[PDB]
Each structure stands twice: as C-alpha cells, then as structure tokens.
Amino acid sequence: RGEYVVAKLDDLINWARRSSLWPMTFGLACCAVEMMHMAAPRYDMDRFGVVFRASPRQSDVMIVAGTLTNKMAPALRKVYDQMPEPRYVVSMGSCANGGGYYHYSYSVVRGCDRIVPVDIYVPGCPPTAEALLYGILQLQKKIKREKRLRIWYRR
Amino acid sequence: VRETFPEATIIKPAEIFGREDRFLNYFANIRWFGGVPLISLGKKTVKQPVYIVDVTKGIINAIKDPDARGKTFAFVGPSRYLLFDLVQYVFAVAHRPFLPYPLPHFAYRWIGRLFEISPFEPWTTRDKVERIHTTDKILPHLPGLEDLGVEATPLELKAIEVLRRHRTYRWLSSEIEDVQPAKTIP
Amino acid sequence: TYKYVNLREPSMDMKSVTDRAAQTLLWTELIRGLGMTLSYLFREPATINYPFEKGPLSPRFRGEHALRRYPSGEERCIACKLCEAVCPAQAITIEAEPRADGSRRTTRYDIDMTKCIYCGFCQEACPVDAIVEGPNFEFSTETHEELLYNKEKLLNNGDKWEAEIAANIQADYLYR
Amino acid sequence: MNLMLALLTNFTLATLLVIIAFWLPQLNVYSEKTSPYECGFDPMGSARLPFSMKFFLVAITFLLFDLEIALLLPLPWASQTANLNTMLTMALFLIILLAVSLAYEWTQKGLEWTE
Amino acid sequence: ELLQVLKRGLQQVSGHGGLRGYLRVLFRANDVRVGTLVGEDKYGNKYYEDNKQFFGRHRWVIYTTEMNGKNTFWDVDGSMVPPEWHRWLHCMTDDPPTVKPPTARKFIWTNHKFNLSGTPQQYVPYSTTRKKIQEWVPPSTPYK
Amino acid sequence: ASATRFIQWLRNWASGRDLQAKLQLRYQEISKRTQPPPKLPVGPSHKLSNNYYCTRDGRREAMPPSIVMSSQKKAVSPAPPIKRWELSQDEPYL
Amino acid sequence: EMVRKCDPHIGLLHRGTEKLIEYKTYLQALPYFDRLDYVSMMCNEQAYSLAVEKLLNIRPPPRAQWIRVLFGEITRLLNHIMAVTTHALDIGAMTPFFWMFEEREKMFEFYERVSGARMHAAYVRPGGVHQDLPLGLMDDIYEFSKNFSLRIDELEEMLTNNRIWRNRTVDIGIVTAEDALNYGFSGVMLRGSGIQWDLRKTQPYD
Amino acid sequence: MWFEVLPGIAVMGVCLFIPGMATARIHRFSNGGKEKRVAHYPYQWYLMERDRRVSGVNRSYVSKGLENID
Amino acid sequence: MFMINILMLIIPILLAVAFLTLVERKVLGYMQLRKGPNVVGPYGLLQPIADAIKLFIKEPLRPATSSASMFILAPIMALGLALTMWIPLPMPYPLINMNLGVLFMLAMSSLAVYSILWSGWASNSKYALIGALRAVAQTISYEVTLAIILLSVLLMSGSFTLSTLITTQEQMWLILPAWPLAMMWFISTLAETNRAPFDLTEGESELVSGFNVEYAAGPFALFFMAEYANIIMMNIFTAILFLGTSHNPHMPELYTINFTIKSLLLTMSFLWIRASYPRFRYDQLMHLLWKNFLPLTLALCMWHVSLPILTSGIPPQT
Ligand SMILES: CCCCCCCCCCCCCCCCCC(=O)OC[C@H](COP(=O)(O)OCCN)OC(=O)CCCCCCCCCCCCCCCCC
Ligand SMILES: CCCCCCCCCCCCO[C@@H]1O[C@H](CO)[C@@H](O[C@H]2O[C@H](CO)[C@@H](O)[C@H](O)[C@H]2O)[C@H](O)[C@H]1O
C-alpha cells in the first residue's frame, strides 16, 4: 500500500525536522535576552536538539526576537531568503508580532509578518524564556502535522 | 463554462513569461542537455508571449469593469517572434552557448514520453512539446489587453528579470542593453 | 575610596622566577582551568524538565489578560476607560452604552495583544479589579489575528482563569 | 590493488552522498536565495579582489623550512650506518643551520606580520 | 556507595510499576524519578513532589494521555494544566488545591481547555458592536 | 545535595574550593512560597490635623529660574576643586 | 585582516523613542526606559525617576531610596554578567556564559517577585517604587548574595590568569585618559585608563 | 547527571571497536587461521611467493611440513 | 573479503563520528551546568540520526557566484580523504600495511587542507575567503613543527611503519621518554584538526562560519563528518604514538579494547579543552608555533638524534 508507506515516510521526515531545529543566530533587541535565557542552563534548548547556528545556509528557523525597523527590514528579508528550505519563522514578542510599543513610530515595521511569513506568534514584552520554549514546542507539533508526502501521493 | 455561467469573463492568454514561468525558464533549462532540439529548427512556429503582470492587471481590471461580463478576451504580448529567434534570444540574455539542431516530431515526441516516466513534476511531456511548437493564434474579433486599459509589456524589457539567475558568475552583472532584441514579425 | 585592579610588581627572586618558568613551560595555569570545568561536569545541572516542570513564578506575575466578574456573575467593568487612558501602548479600545437595563457597560473591549507591553498599568488603573493580567503565559498562536482579543475572548479568559486569578489577587492585594 | 580499491571506495561513497544530497531534497531556486552571503546586506565589491597577505615573508620561509624536513626525514635510516661519526656531525650540522636561519629571521623581524 | 547508587536506580523501576511503566515515563517525560503523589485532577494529570530536589525540580506533573477527546500520549503541552494546579505547579503558592481548594463560582469553567490555536475551535476576532449608521430604505412600491 | 562522597571529593579537589557549602542550586534554605499577609505602614502625611496640603506641597514651591545676567574681584570656579580620593584600606591592590 | 577603518552604521534599532515619549504622560513614558539599555532596566527607570522627581521638587521616601539602591546594584550584577560573559563568549570562551546566566536567572526572579515581570519591571517610578517588597524576599536575596562571590571566583579561574585570555585582551584597545575625556567616554571606559570618576561617589543620588 | 553521558560514549566505543576487531578476524579467516603475512621487504615477499608455489594450491598461507619430504 | 573489510571500516567510522557529535553536546552540556540532548531518543541517543536525516533532506544551495565544480569537489574530497586516513591504522592490524605509513598520513593530511582552500575560494564570498586564508596561515604554522616532532619520536621507533610503534612500546609508553614532544604534538593536532582554541578557519564568532558559510544540507554535513572523523583519527594516532598498547597475537581483541579506551579518552580531552579556553588570534597561533614550539622542537630533534647514539640504544631498522 502506497498510502501506508507515504504516511510512515512523513512521520520519519517530520520527526527528523522537528527533532533537529537549528535557529539562526539572529536577535534584534530586548527579546534576544530572553532567547539567551532559553539557551541558558535552566531551560537548555539544546537538550531538545535546538542548536543555534550563525549561517543562514545552516539554519531552519528564524526567531525574530525584537523590534524590526525599516532600516533593518531589507536585511532580515535577505537572510530569510538565504535560508534553505524547509524554513520556519517564529515571531517573538510584541514588537515583532505587530509593532508593540513602537507601533506608531515612523521608523518601525508594524509586525514582521509584513516582511516574512510567520509560523508561530509568541506573545509578551518580552515573553518569558519559558513562553518562548512553549512557542518552539508548538512549532515542533506543527511540523509533526505536516503531510507533504501524503499530499504528493494524492496529487 | 460559457453555458454554465453565461456572464463569465473568459480570458485566453498566450504563454505567460515571468519569474516562476514554465516558458522562458523552460527554454533556459534545456542547456543541461547541451544543444537545444527544435521541431524543424523552430522556423515553422510563431509565439506571442505575454507578461505575467500584464495578465494579472487584466484580470484585476476585468473584476472592476462592468463591460467584462460575458466577454472573451485574448491576452497577447506586443510582438510576435519565430520560435527559433525567441529561443535564441533566451540564450543570448542568459549568456549560454546556443547550439540548435533539428529533431523530427516523432523522435521528439518520443523524448517527451521518456521524461513522462517521472513520478514527480515532469521536466517535459509530449503535450508540452506540442504546445511549445503550436503557432499562437491571431483572433482579431476578440478584445485584448488594451480593451482593459493595460499596455502589453514587451518581452525585451523583462527577460533579464527572469533570466539573470540562469547566467554564470562571469555574466551575472551584464546589463539590459548588451543583447540585441530578437527579430519580430510585422 | 578606590583600588587598583592591575598594578603589581612581580618578584624577581630565583624561586619566583622558576615558578613562572614552570608555569610557562608546564602550562600550570591552563591545567588549573581544566580542573574547574571538570568540577562542573560532576555537578548536578540546573536544567528543569519543561513542560513537566515549570519555572517558579509569583502572585504578581503579569501574563494573559482577563475580564473578571463579581460573585453574582455581573461584570466588574463599568466602562470607565481608565485602563484605556493609561495604556502606554494604546492597546485597549472601548465603546460603551447603557445596557438594556440601566447599567453602564461596554459594548466593545479590545486588547491588541501585539501592541500590549504587558506592563500592568491597566490593572493598576482599574478601580474595580475588572481587567487583570493573569498567570497564563502559554498562549502562543499560529496566526496574528488570534492575538487581537475582543470582549468575548477576554470574558472567556476570566471565566477560564478566575479560580487561579482570585487566589493570586488574594495573596497580593495587601501590597497594593 | 588493495590500496586503490580503498581509495576508490572512500571517494565513491563521498560522491554518492553528494549525489543523494542534491537529488533527494525538494529544491526551490530563486535569485535572492542564491545571492552571496554578507550578514544581510549586499556585498561591496567582488570577493575575487586582492586580499593582502601580512605573513607573506613567513609563507616563503615555510617553503625553505619544509624542504628541511625532507632532508631530515631519512635520519632514522641514517642512524644504521656504521660511519656514525660522520652522520651525527652532519645531522647536527643541518639542524643547527636550520636553527641559525630561524634565529636570523627572528632577530631581523621577519616573523612579525607587516602592517 | 556505588552499590547504593545502583539500588536507587533499580528502586526506580519498581517505583514506576515495573519495567513497562518505567519505560512509559522514560519515553513520555524523559525522566524516571519517583515522587510523592500529591493528587490528580479530573482530566487525568498526576502531580508529584520531592522536596529533596532543588527548587524547580521539586514539583512536576505527568500529563494525562487523553484530554478533552484528544490523544496526548505523545503530544503534551503546558496549557493542559488546569488553573487550580497551575498555581501550585508554578510555585505561586505552597498549597495544592487538594488542601486549599479554590473558591467555587457558577461562571467558572467546569472543563478546562488547552491551547486551541490551529484547530477548528480556535479564536477568530470580530467587532462586537452593531452597525452605527442606518441607511434609508426606498419604498417597495412604484410611485413616479 | 545528592552527590556521593567520592564525587563530592573529586569535584571539590578539581575546583580547589569547598563547593558543598555554597551550592549554586537552591534547596530548602529559600523562603516559603506562601507567606503571612503583610500590614504595611503609612506615610507621614497620614494625619487628621496639622496636615494642610499647602504646607507640604513640593510642586508649588518650585520657582522659575533666577536670571543672573540678561542682555536686555576674585576669580571663581563652578565649585571648589574636588578633594583627592584615598586608597582603600579594605584592599588597595587587587 | 588588519582593520583600516571602522564605520559603524547604526539606527537599525532606531524606534523613535524620543518622539513617542512626547505623546505620553510622565507615567506612560516610564516603560520606554526599561527598553533602552534592556540589560539594566531598573537603573534606566531610576535615572528617569530622579529627573522627574527633580522637576516636581518632591523627594522619594527613605525606604524607596534604599530599595532603589538595592535593585540598582542587583541590576549592575545583571549587566556585568552579560557584559563579561558575552565578551568572553565572543573571544571564544563560551562556558562562563552558561555558569553565570543561571545566576542571572535567579536575579530575574527577584525582578519578577517585586514587579511580576522578569525584565521590564516598570518598578522604579517618580516618587519611589510601585509596590513594597514581598515578605521573605530579602531573605532570598541574602541567600543569593552569600554564594555569588564564589561564582565570580570561578569566572576568574577561567579567564583572569589565562594566558590565552590575556593575549586576546592585554594591550588591545588602549585609550589614553585625555582621549577618553574628549571623546565623551564614561564609566569603566574612563576608569580603565586611570581616571578617578564615579558619579555614585562624586555626585551621589538616593 | 554526568552518568547520562555514558550511553553515548559506550555507543561510540563499540563503533570504534568494530574496525579493529573486524580486521583481525577477517585476516585470520582469509589466511587459514593465522595472522596475515607481513612483507615489508623484498626478502619476505620472496619467501611468500615460494610458499605460494610450494603449497600446491597457489596459496601462500597453506604451509607444508615434514610430511612433504620423502 | 577485502571489500567487506573496507565496509567494516567506513561504516563504523561514520557511526562513531555521528555519536561523537552527541557525546560532544552532552559533555559540553554538563561542563556548562546543563544536560544537552536528552529528548530525541533515550538520553538523546537518536539525536545524531535526526540531524543526519534532516540535513540530507534539506535543500542544498549552489551560490550564484560560486565556481560550481570546485564547490562540489571540495566536500567530496574532505570526506574521502578523512576516511583514507584510517586505512593504515593498526588496531592492531591495519587495513593497509604500509612501510611509510607515517609519511602517508602526512601527505594525506596536507592534501586535506585543499578541501578547505577550494571550498572557501569556490564559494566566491568574503567570509569564506577569509576563512580559507586562515587555513593557509594555520597550515604554515603547524606542519613544519608537526613533521619534525614525528621524526624525533621515530628516532626511538626506528621506522615509519605504524605497526612498529606497537613493538617499540612493548615495555613502556613512549610518553615517558618524550613527554615534551607529546605536549607539543597534542597541541599541534588541535591546530591540525582546526579545533578550539585553534578553531580559526570556521571562527564562528568572528567569521560567522568561515570557509563553509555558503554550504548547506548534505554538502555541509560532509565537512562536519570529515572534521569529526579527523578528531578521532588524530587521537588514535596520538594513542599509537605515545600510549602504546601491548599486543597479544592470539587475543587481538584485548588490544582493541585497551586501545579504544585510550583513544576515546584522548578524544574527550578535545571536548574538555573546547569547553575551557578562549580562542587564539590566528597571528598568535603562528607565533606560538614558530617562536616557542619550533625552537624547542629543533633542539629536541638534535637531542633525539644524539641520545640513541650516545646511549647505544639505536632501534633496529627492521
Ligand atoms: C636530561 C636531558 C633531558 C633533555 C630534555 C629536558 C627538557 C624538559 C623540559 C622542556 C620543556 C617541556 C615543555 C615543552 C612543551 C612546550 C612548552 C611551551 O612552549 O609552552 C609555552 C607556550 C608559550 O606561551 P607564552 O607563555 O604566552 O609565551 C612564552 C614567551 N613568549 O605556551 C603554550 O604552548 C600554551 C598552549 C595553549 C593551548 C593549550 C590547550 C591545551 C592545554 C592542555 C594540554 C595538556 C597537555 C596534555 C598532553 C597530552 C599528551 C599526549
Ligand atoms: C639548535 C636548536 C636550538 C636553537 C634555538 C634556535 C632558535 C633561536 C631563537 C632566536 C634567539 C634570538 O632571537 C630573538 O631575537 C629577539 C630580538 O628581536 C629577542 O627578543 C625579542 O623577541 C621576544 C619574543 O618575540 C620578545 O619578547 C622581546 O620583546 C623582543 O626583545 C628574542 O627573545 C630572541 O629569541
């Protein structure tokens, strides 16, 4: 049965992708400090297989951790575009979510979803390190629900 | 569709060229096989390709225009080209060596079925081979892009937008003025 | 008063000069640094087992917003708009009118959770403890629109979290 | 034949893994993805421009010193000679001269990188 | 003392109802410590404590395998903890709801719900106010 | 706190310190998470008499700046020269 | 790899804070100061609170002033840990960052217990502080403080006498006392060159 | 706890054990239960090639004793 | 029967490398007061598999400006040469017995440098170029010292055959008579394998990712696999050189147990060292080797030429 095989193969690739998420070393402002706290010993994101890597070529997730200005917007789009696929974006904190407390500023992008597609929105100013860790686990369960090969099979 | 929905606006484009097209990109990707096979060298085919943004604007303007109901439009580009010149132009813009050679329909229809074995997206099919070599009809009775307030964008102004990524590093920076336009057909 | 962090004259007697010679050639101060990371290898790590274990919080924690009721089930909010006035981020939007009875109540009460800075000024400003920041911090969503809370969402939050919220207010209201 | 088989197997397996890596994943190629990386902003000038070498003098010296090891490698075999008086002198003579050149380049500031 | 260490390890297998239960928790929660059961909530979650563990690890929950019709044997998240145990688990208080029950209100949810984002029962925003301008309606009869 | 004797000796020796006396993980020495209720004091203005606000109104005592010169003897400095600092008796040299 | 010119292009985090503040009351503008040097949140609050108190011609009460100094020094620990460990991390010494952010994690707990927020407390306000210390908090601060000096020693055992660390830091970025003054430097950027200046000593507050 | 690192070390150790064990056993199997002959120098190769001829089965590792003298 | 032997070499190497990544993450984790991978499989045992599968189903990228042929060649060469470094290693029997096995490894190690040089150059990117030229500088720093150190040790062994090092150390480890060489050798292998505190060609905190900044997915994995395979190989080489294991011909597996333990512990020290020190500046690496190791290595080479002659302890040529 092809249906059974592709179903299992999705489980395999989905499990590999969510079990080895490598976020880009990318942070913008306050919220990057809570992201550093998620890497710190108490939460130790690395114990989930979540490893920071600097190069976009070697990254799977962009955590937009902080305010996106108009001056920084092209640069953020550049490094997102340079990520190989599949790639995911986590929007962290009010600034990245929808502009936050600089929403009405002339120099601030009102939400990073104007620039990149966003998979998970993590609320808070800043979200606690645990709130971000909850967001990463929510992304893992989203990846676990992907049906790429099942959809390919039925095309 | 016309009987089922008599007020439908039906739009009949030629081949649409653009960044994600399967037209200009299709020709440029033939380089991976060396030479470019063309039925009768592509001298017995005329295309009138149309720009994606022109088609999009035509669709948007048809939604707002009340005249577009129950009408049929033909969205064509501003110039007609022989297939040989068009494919030659593609390789000139991409700065790739162009080595055309005739291939008969039966032999080239046989290559299409070969590639049809792919369980994924076929690189080419027999149907695609026929469509590429079908001369683009002339339908004066139908309204066109100009009837929707759209100026058809010439191929020469947007090919580099599509074909720059097919160049090697040596030729990436070449500007829009380096390649001579292909011969058209008045 | 001040002190010098790095103003030393090293000893030049033979013993001190040989102790530095051994240090340079035998890497003694580098070995000492290996001992310290070795000593951490054998310590118990500080990692907790999230989500089975949670980081400690206090009753003052500022999390997800909720609109509260009186014990009778009446809304506490009276549409005074003090929370809307003080909101540093202009994240609250309110409309109000006389209810079908004579009551002063809101018809719109929105919080743009992507404008909010979770500062808690709204619950400080509220005269009737109607709007609070609750203890919930695990409400990340897949879409932006899910973070634009209207009055129905906030009343549901209060009904969902009142048991914990009331106990947290009970622990902290004498500090307020 | 054993060695050539081992070399052929090693590089074949490496080539096979590259082939899988390029033909198994789903590709999505466009201009912005494949542009050169430089921290989010477009590079200023080409990466083929000259890159100054500040250790140029050490690199040339490496050539002369690398040939010394070719001259010193046979020493374990040279120790089997009956004529041990001559080899020991010449073995020590070569090393001392290698040490002398290092001392000369060191004192003349050849090991310091240019500014 | 090494043998004493290994006996504590073996006592963990028995403390988890045999090797099957031991493997169940090891694969569900990636931890096999045995704690004192503090209580269970109506959704099946079980709450444990061990006050000789350092602050932060001295309390924990073993999530229920099924909650609200959803299979949570492998898929668990922090939003499955109901409010009464939320306070105890996050150390906002010392007293579990078994000892210090919460105040009962008619309007409080009887059935807690986890995070519903990404499902058909997710929250969708909308304006809660009614139309502000009434448009004139022309007469339904001709007269002209 | 649960480390065996041998491991305690090994890691104490490796670091050169007595680690057990100053453990970086918290145990029972920290405060209870349930505390008795406070009863906070009141400030000095909580009086029923002799408490007229006009006599304790800081804002209304602020005055507009004093004009020294408008464009309408011994030399001075902005303040006396700063006294020289002294070395710590606690530990003059780190 | 020799640097001939450094041209810092900033403004990639410019969010018009100073224009936004003009549309806020003095209370509403305070949280903007948490988000400036977002590693020294309460110190930023205090600077603003002192300025508004000075214009109001009021004085915060002694207990608030003592709480401000206490949490100002707690904040200095949070900042200096970040400053030293990320600096060490950039130079390739990654391990001390982890040891010390578990201490930083314990200090966010003090922030959260007085304000309910780990970072942007908005706790120090013109007139004093928002709320009083919860009972049992000073006991916990004392427990934390009693062990921290040992953590600093562990940091020093990794870096201070490390010949690799000294090679990377000794004689790097020398600034003369005269240049530091004219270039507008302050704080450790002045005291590193021998200048004897500290506003807590020369122009004390609270 | 630090001993949770051991399972990875043990798995790495068993992997690094296999090449050394496999080469030894394969050499015994391919050389009639003995160590593979080492021929670093031409003399040792000469003796090997003689043993290949002397064997009678074209195998340098099949050795003939006093039963092969008459 | 030789092809089976080849596979019983390559396959364990790759699996050992994969689980070295897990061990490194755990050891760094615990030395940093955290745990490291412990969710993906029990004790994080499946983490290496997830990383491997994930990387090979990730889209690979050919940069628009890169030189395609050398861009693809370089990662192939890195892994191919990494596996070739193992064929002469006696554990206790080599796959390929070589008279000059020591020299073969010097040649293959020098050739493996070009996988850094050509990957970095072929990328046509500034951070990749800077990383590549750091590889030139780092090779210039260590190779001259590295080969002369081997020569000093082999003056006691008597040949370039790797199996003879076992015989030389039947009564005693060579680390006793040559601990000054063992120290300078151990540091050299850290620079040889581009390991901290000499992790300069990738130099993450300075060059983002250095020579392999443009590599993704499978091609990136090959460089990672090659890098970790050389960590193990050069610590095995160190164990053979200085911590010789006794070989019982009738129970070779006893050798492989003791030999494996020593090589593992040496490999752990690479992780231990990475967790403990900051990074050299790459000009300071050159001056470390040329102004400290080289003067002492030259002096010790003279000493180890003379010492066998003056003590009448010259080793046999065979
Ligand atoms: C009877 C006759 C006998 C004749 C022979 C007698 C001679 C015996 C004594 C000779 C001296 C023995 C030591 C020689 C080894 C080389 C020593 C050396 O050069 O170290 C100094 C070097 C320079 O550093 P620095 O201090 O900054 O500069 C000095 C002034 N310019 O600094 C360094 O090299 C530091 C290197 C930094 C990186 C270190 C990272 C790893 C540290 C832990 C390694 C532990 C060693 C384990 C070895 C394993 C063995 C297999
Ligand atoms: C036969 C084998 C053993 C022989 C050793 C061969 C190597 C000899 C090394 C050169 C010795 C003399 O050459 C060298 O000259 C310079 C003067 O610029 C000396 O001094 C200079 O260099 C050293 C180190 O760089 C600096 O700390 C010092 O500030 C500077 O004055 C060196 O200390 C000395 O080493």
Ligand code: SF4
């Ligand atoms: S969301 Fe809050 S904490 Fe995060 S960057 Fe913006 S202001 Fe700072």
Ligand code: SF4
């Ligand atoms: S917490 Fe602050 S920003 Fe959020 S709604 Fe309340 S007052 Fe506004």
Ligand code: SF4
């Ligand atoms: S929530 Fe409170 S402050 Fe806001 S309008 Fe209602 S009663 Fe007023």
